[PDB]
Amino acid sequence: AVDTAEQVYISSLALLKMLKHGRAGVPMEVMGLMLGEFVDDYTVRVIDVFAMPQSGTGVSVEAVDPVFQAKMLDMLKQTGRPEMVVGWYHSHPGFGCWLSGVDINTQQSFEALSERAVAVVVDPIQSVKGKVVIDAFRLINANMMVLGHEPRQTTSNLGHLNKPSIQALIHGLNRHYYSITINYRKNELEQKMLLNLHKKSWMEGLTLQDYSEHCKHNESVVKEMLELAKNYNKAVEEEDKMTPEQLAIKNVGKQDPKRHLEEHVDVLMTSNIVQCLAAMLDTVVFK
Amino acid sequence: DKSKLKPGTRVALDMTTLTIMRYLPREVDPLVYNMSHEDPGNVSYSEIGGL
Amino acid sequence: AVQKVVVHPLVLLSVVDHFNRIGKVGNQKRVVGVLLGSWQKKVLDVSNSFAVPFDEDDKDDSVWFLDHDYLENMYGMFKKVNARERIVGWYHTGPKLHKNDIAINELMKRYCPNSVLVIIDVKPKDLGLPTEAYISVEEVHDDGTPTSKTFEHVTSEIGAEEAEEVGVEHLLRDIKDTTVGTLSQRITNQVHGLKGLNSKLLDIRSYLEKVATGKLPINHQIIYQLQDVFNLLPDVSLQEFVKAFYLKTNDQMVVVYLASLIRSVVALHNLINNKIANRDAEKKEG
Amino acid sequence: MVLESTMVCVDNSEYMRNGDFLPTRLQAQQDAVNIVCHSKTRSNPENNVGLITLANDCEVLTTLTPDTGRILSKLHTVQPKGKITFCTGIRVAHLALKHRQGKNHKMRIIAFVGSPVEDNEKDLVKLAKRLKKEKVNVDIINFGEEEVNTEKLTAFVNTLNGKDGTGSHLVTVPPGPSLADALISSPILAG
Ligand SMILES: [Zn+2]
């Protein structure tokens, strides 16, 4: 009787912990517990996540330790705020985002204690710059398939927005477990304290970058255009011939002065414009 | 550690996501092992007469 | 001591989450915790942080509590998950470096003999970096007080790990200095640098308000540095310096000239390459 | 029982090391705690004890902890040296209660006063004033042979129990070498 609009909100901070722990044990399958709060009959939100110590050698999520669970949970409450374990996350190095046989088996354990537990898989290698790749999942009852009645009782065009990955579909996707849409919560205090902080400098603006070395860099770059320009002449006559596709493929083994010359010019103009501009700006700021 | 993984070092890799998980000593071919722990005879210099 | 302290985004975020989690009082109260990280070649790195309970009444700032057992017990938890990270210092919101945070360092001096406290504002609306890292340095003198022990600042910048950067840039998807060239430099260092210089200069002016209404009876040392600052001001731009500048400012213009000319030629050929394309297409078509 | 949590307030003043009871007022103190911490436990199998020094400033040794041996061992290496700052001493114990374990434990702190006490009244009433506001009863035990009857705390304890506020009581000991023993019975009995 799920609502196929779960929309598990994760965090602006729980994600960073998930990724950092995932990459730390990249060869293995680290596991942890999600500390979130159920809110609606339609949404489950996580707030914080804490890792569980690795049992040792072996790429598996075999079991959780009850005593460690209690000790940290009973310790976070007395300083932070109480939270209830809502799901567990384990990082798949590069396989993808799905649940294996062991992962399914460990999952029903959590569901037994809590009906709406959510399992999450984080991939720390596939995610590169703007894609994190999580795809939180949950199990489907075997009785339903035996009954044959389709689960999730779709009542909105919200869950069928992400095309399931073919790699995930090969495994028990929509057969032994169903994915739940995952979105994120972001606020200006979080964003402004991260975006306007990551790549910044204090006083590098008014620094003249080793004026002696600056012109030496210019001489080396310009001298490269002397030979580069000469090859440009030899690269214009032989062009504009038949089968330009033949010409296009003919530039797959030898440097093309058309692009190389422009690249050097681009760096040359910006380096001096900035370097020169700082000269006059400084001459007025300081005496 | 990423300092003992010099070129030529034997390294074990994971089955699913190939990733070095241990540097290993140079292997000894089983023939070479059998080529060393061989002699039970224990012949003494006093038996090879004439030479 | 330590040349610089790099603060990972995760630690920066776990401090904002800490304040909101306990800041239900609303009006005002600092929040204090324990930092974790590792350093190499005399450069510290801070990666993880956990909240240590801490309360202190405002009046008579010589009373405060920090749970040693909580610090010891929890560190056993963090040690098990990751052994590389070991206690390196402590953090507290403390926008103004409250006075009592010079005996607290002694409390944490046990776990990390050379610990660093990083003040990271939770409510920043400003232009400067919200991470000041200080280290304890000792020297007793006859001017200030018989017991002399003061913090010395260490430059701090926001770091980035391969895993964290993926999430951090995904979490923003808000604004980026795309096409990072002459556009970002003219704004990321030139205009911003001037803003910072003015604010720091304005900060000096505010302290010098003691000339009329004394706050502290002339710090002496602060004046000494200010005198040296003025002498270090670049010598008046009227002597042979002016010729040296022109002989170098103009020398940089020749390269700009040459670069622009090459740019025009390549631009002109590009137009010819394209223009002949549609003329050929049109001619064959009709 | 009744899910109580006590935060012991130990004394280590320099004049506290004279043996007018038997093994100086250092072992006399250590035996005193032993007969209370264990007595403090054994009623509800979930209690909590914490020892705090009344030395020159904020000196806290062990925090809120169900264990019993830690306090005893931590009591050693407590050689007395310096003055006692009572007024700023209880508050430090006061905060420990605020940042406690599961808050369903009743809060109380037993005092271990001793070498000549220093207070200016008035402020002490305020000191007792706040604690009596927030579900807190303190237990100052007269000890170390302060001024007879300690007529400075007398204005203190009554404030907490004022308005028929039955609770902890001030306990004194004869200046003679009266062994600590079970002599401390006013709070443990029913308060
Ligand atoms: Zn898995």
Side-chain angles (χ1 to χ4, degrees):
Chain A
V2 317
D3 57 87
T4 166
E6 282 60 6
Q7 203 96 8
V8 179
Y9 306 67
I10 274 189
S11 86
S12 266
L13 173 156
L15 185 128
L16 284 186
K17 247 143 158 186
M18 266 150 84
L19 265 200
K20 198 196 127 274
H21 184 197
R23 193 30 183 287
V26 85
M28 313 96 55
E29 247 191 334
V30 302
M31 170 230 62
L33 302 213
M34 288 202 291
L35 285 169
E37 311 61 8
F38 288 96
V39 278
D40 273 302
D41 215 335
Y42 284 75
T43 91
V44 45
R45 76 167 27 181
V46 342
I47 193 70
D48 171 333
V49 157
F50 78 115
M52 272 264 312
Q54 255 315 3
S55 295
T57 52
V59 188
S60 70
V61 286
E62 169 78 18
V64 310
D65 173 345
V67 52
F68 194 91
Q69 221 178 102
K71 224 177 162 304
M72 172 103 53
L73 240 187
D74 290 17
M75 202 144 320
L76 262 179
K77 148 134 55 63
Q78 106 182 355
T79 185
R81 65 285 182 258
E83 318 288 21
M84 26 166 295
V85 283
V86 301
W88 65 293
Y89 73 123
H90 60 280
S91 171
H92 276 137
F95 326 139
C97 296
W98 40 274
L99 279 314
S100 151
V102 176
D103 306 54
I104 298 203
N105 184 6
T106 172
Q107 229 292 339
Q108 63 242 57
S109 96
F110 279 34
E111 218 166 86
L113 305 312
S114 181
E115 163 45 8
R116 312 261 308 307
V118 177
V120 163
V121 152
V122 86
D123 185 353
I125 301 328
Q126 282 219 138
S127 53
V128 309
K129 288 326 316 273
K131 285 326 304 328
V132 152
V133 190
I134 296 208
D135 227 354
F137 286 110
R138 192 198 270 153
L139 268 38
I140 44 68
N141 183 342
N143 153 284
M144 219 58 260
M145 64 164 336
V146 166
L147 258 296
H149 218 276
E150 265 84 356
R152 323 207 38 211
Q153 59 109 35
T154 197
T155 91
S156 150
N157 202 177
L158 182 176
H160 300 8
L161 292 204
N162 332 97
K163 291 162 157 142
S165 89
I166 188 42
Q167 177 132 3
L169 203 30
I170 274 301
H171 306 194
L173 191 53
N174 315 49
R175 211 181 301 131
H176 305 76
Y177 47 62
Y178 59 112
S179 151
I180 272 157
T181 170
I182 163 168
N183 91 4
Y184 302 102
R185 187 303 305 267
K186 330 153 307 308
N187 51 54
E188 176 248 330
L189 170 59
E190 225 270 327
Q191 249 177 68
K192 223 249 201 180
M193 209 221 67
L194 198 148
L195 177 144
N196 213 356
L197 309 209
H198 204 16
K199 260 21 190 162
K200 314 205 56 173
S201 303
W202 323 262
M203 297 320 215
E204 76 192 22
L206 305 312
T207 47
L208 279 297
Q209 186 261 15
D210 196 347
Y211 230 121
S212 164
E213 204 245 331
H214 173 265
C215 303
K216 176 215 58 47
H217 186 211
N218 264 23
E219 159 68 44
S220 293
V221 153
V222 151
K223 172 179 319 316
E224 249 281 10
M225 301 165 85
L226 190 151
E227 177 303 327
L228 227 37
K230 168 77 199 307
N231 254 286
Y232 195 13
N233 163 337
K234 209 102 219 157
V236 160
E237 288 54 353
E238 89 283 42
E239 288 303 315
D240 205 73
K241 301 313 285 182
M242 85 265 276
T243 171
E245 54 94 21
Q246 173 54 241
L247 270 299
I249 199 169
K250 207 172 61 185
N251 298 318
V252 314
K254 31 201 188 294
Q255 43 99 35
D256 49 333
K258 178 39 172 304
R259 206 177 55 46
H260 224 248
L261 194 51
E262 145 74 64
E263 165 39 0
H264 285 291
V265 179
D266 210 359
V267 88
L268 246 200
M269 257 201 51
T270 88
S271 200
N272 304 61
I273 272 164
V274 169
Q275 166 48 228
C276 208
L277 181 134
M280 304 56 87
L281 256 284
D282 277 5
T283 48
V284 171
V285 173
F286 308 129
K287 180 71 83 62
Chain B
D1 79 1
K2 275 175 283 269
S3 149
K4 313 279 325 313
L5 272 59
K6 309 182 334 313
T9 318
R10 204 162 64 144
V11 277
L13 321 175
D14 209 280
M15 235 202 310
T16 46
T17 172
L18 290 92
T19 324
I20 327 183
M21 331 203 321
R22 167 153 13 228
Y23 64 69
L24 277 175
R26 172 201 281 300
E27 105 180 320
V28 284
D29 183 352
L31 288 124
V32 189
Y33 190 79
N34 282 19
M35 269 210 252
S36 191
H37 302 135
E38 172 115 350
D39 184 3
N42 186 32
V43 86
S44 48
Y45 270 163
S46 75
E47 276 162 292
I48 164 176
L51 298 84
Chain C
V2 306
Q3 281 81 73
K4 82 167 324 284
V5 163
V6 158
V7 202
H8 283 195
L10 167 50
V11 86
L12 224 56
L13 258 47
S14 170
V15 177
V16 151
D17 165 37
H18 190 201
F19 197 16
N20 292 343
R21 95 201 307 186
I22 168 170
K24 56 201 172 184
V25 78
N27 309 309
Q28 159 61 231
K29 45 168 63 133
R30 64 209 299 181
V31 195
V32 154
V34 152
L35 266 207
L36 300 89
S38 67
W39 47 16
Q40 50 226 287
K41 39 200 152 295
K42 269 287 137 207
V43 152
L44 197 34
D45 186 355
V46 286
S47 66
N48 225 343
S49 34
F50 57 104
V52 317
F54 165 78
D55 214 335
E56 152 271 353
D57 90 9
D58 222 326
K59 295 185 189 293
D60 185 329
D61 74 353
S62 152
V63 287
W64 44 268
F65 177 43
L66 204 140
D67 225 359
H68 314 349
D69 198 9
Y70 184 103
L71 204 31
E72 280 300 317
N73 265 228
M74 173 105 81
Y75 183 72
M77 266 60 156
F78 271 68
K79 205 155 50 30
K80 289 206 212 30
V81 55
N82 203 338
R84 175 36 189 289
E85 307 167 347
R86 21 72 184 175
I87 282 193
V88 85
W90 63 300
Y91 78 108
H92 79 77
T93 291
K96 302 270 104 178
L97 201 164
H98 314 172
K99 169 142 28 53
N100 73 356
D101 282 330
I102 198 43
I104 278 183
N105 222 7
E106 311 288 13
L107 185 278
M108 291 229 57
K109 219 73 171 284
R110 269 124 73 176
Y111 313 138
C112 178
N114 47 1
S115 80
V116 317
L117 84 82
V118 281
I119 308 144
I120 47 181
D121 313 356
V122 157
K123 287 172 278 191
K125 41 177 73 65
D126 35 353
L127 73 187
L129 222 39
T131 279
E132 319 304 74
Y134 309 163
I135 169 64
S136 147
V137 152
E138 283 189 354
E139 86 289 11
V140 182
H141 263 75
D142 309 333
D143 195 79
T145 40
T147 323
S148 188
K149 202 199 311 294
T150 279
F151 284 122
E152 262 259 0
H153 177 272
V154 194
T155 164
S156 100
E157 66 175 24
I158 276 43
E161 157 137 39
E162 169 60 42
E164 275 165 12
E165 270 231 7
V166 177
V168 151
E169 270 151 79
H170 158 84
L171 272 182
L172 312 184
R173 278 303 254 292
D174 175 10
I175 172 60
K176 181 151 46 69
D177 43 358
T178 63
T179 64
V180 191
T182 192
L183 84 91
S184 184
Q185 302 225 340
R186 286 280 89 78
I187 87 177
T188 208
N189 50 69
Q190 300 290 168
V191 69
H192 263 222
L194 268 286
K195 295 286 82 163
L197 193 33
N198 214 21
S199 294
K200 257 55 156 74
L201 264 290
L202 257 191
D203 207 342
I204 312 199
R205 193 158 83 50
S206 100
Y207 167 81
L208 286 209
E209 213 34 33
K210 158 278 313 291
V211 312
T213 165
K215 314 99 150 187
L216 267 281
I218 295 112
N219 172 277
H220 267 326
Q221 189 111 345
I222 272 290
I223 326 291
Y224 278 1
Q225 281 170 344
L226 265 78
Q227 329 225 15
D228 277 4
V229 159
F230 288 24
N231 264 313
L232 222 33
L233 267 195
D235 171 56
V236 277
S237 185
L238 51 93
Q239 40 288 54
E240 289 89 27
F241 167 89
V242 80
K243 295 174 29 44
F245 181 55
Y246 282 151
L247 212 157
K248 261 311 182 213
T249 172
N250 84 38
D251 191 347
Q252 272 149 1
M253 244 50 96
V254 171
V255 152
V256 180
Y257 180 10
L258 183 150
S260 50
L261 200 132
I262 306 308
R263 197 165 155 253
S264 100
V265 160
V266 60
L268 228 40
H269 158 257
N270 217 254
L271 178 273
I272 285 322
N273 162 22
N274 159 301
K275 149 167 305 178
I276 180 46
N278 59 356
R279 191 182 81 83
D280 283 344
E282 287 300 321
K283 201 256 181 182
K284 286 300 120 177
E285 192 179 2
Chain D
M1 83 231 86
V2 83
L3 297 95
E4 89 275 26
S5 281
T6 198
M7 260 272 307
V8 174
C9 164
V10 161
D11 161 347
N12 68 341
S13 297
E14 93 158 43
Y15 279 35
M16 155 70 49
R17 75 211 260 221
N18 46 17
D20 87 312
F21 298 160
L22 175 57
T24 36
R25 342 187 195 180
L26 214 179
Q27 276 295 159
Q29 198 60 174
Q30 219 167 199
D31 195 356
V33 300
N34 247 6
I35 59 198
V36 47
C37 35
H38 262 102
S39 187
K40 182 32 58 163
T41 326
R42 213 143 42 222
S43 36
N44 175 21
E46 196 191 343
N47 311 348
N48 218 37
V49 202
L51 79 148
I52 302 72
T53 296
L54 271 274
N56 34 302
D57 39 356
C58 172
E59 184 33 73
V60 73
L61 296 168
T62 278
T63 176
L64 260 49
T65 170
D67 166 285
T68 204
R70 280 253 207 76
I71 323 94
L72 325 190
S73 84
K74 249 298 170 292
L75 254 298
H76 269 35
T77 69
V78 77
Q79 327 335 333
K81 148 214 152 59
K83 185 38 189 182
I84 189 157
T85 192
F86 187 91
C87 154
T88 88
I90 319 86
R91 50 201 55 280
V92 152
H94 177 202
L95 324 181
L97 291 49
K98 292 240 285 215
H99 304 5
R100 82 177 102 260
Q101 204 39 293
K103 338 295 280 283
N104 282 321
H105 300 75
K106 213 48 50 54
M107 29 201 160
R108 87 147 82 267
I109 60 183
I110 38 60
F112 268 171
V113 78
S115 198
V117 47
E118 165 43 27
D119 59 69
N120 74 12
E121 243 162 53
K122 310 163 54 58
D123 184 304
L124 263 281
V125 152
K126 285 195 217 336
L127 252 292
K129 209 205 310 147
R130 262 180 21 236
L131 328 182
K132 90 196 180 181
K133 329 263 158 298
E134 332 164 344
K135 310 345 300 192
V136 155
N137 78 336
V138 55
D139 201 359
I140 278 66
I141 87 177
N142 204 175
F143 217 67
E145 202 205 305
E146 296 150 291
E147 91 289 28
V148 53
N149 205 10
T150 325
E151 303 269 352
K152 276 170 297 306
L153 264 276
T154 326
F156 186 84
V157 161
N158 315 359
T159 34
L160 303 213
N161 326 69
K163 307 174 183 178
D164 318 302
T166 189
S168 308
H169 322 119
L170 212 54
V171 300
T172 324
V173 299
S178 274
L179 201 284
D181 72 14
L183 188 269
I184 57 200
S185 277
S186 87
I188 300 73
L189 201 76

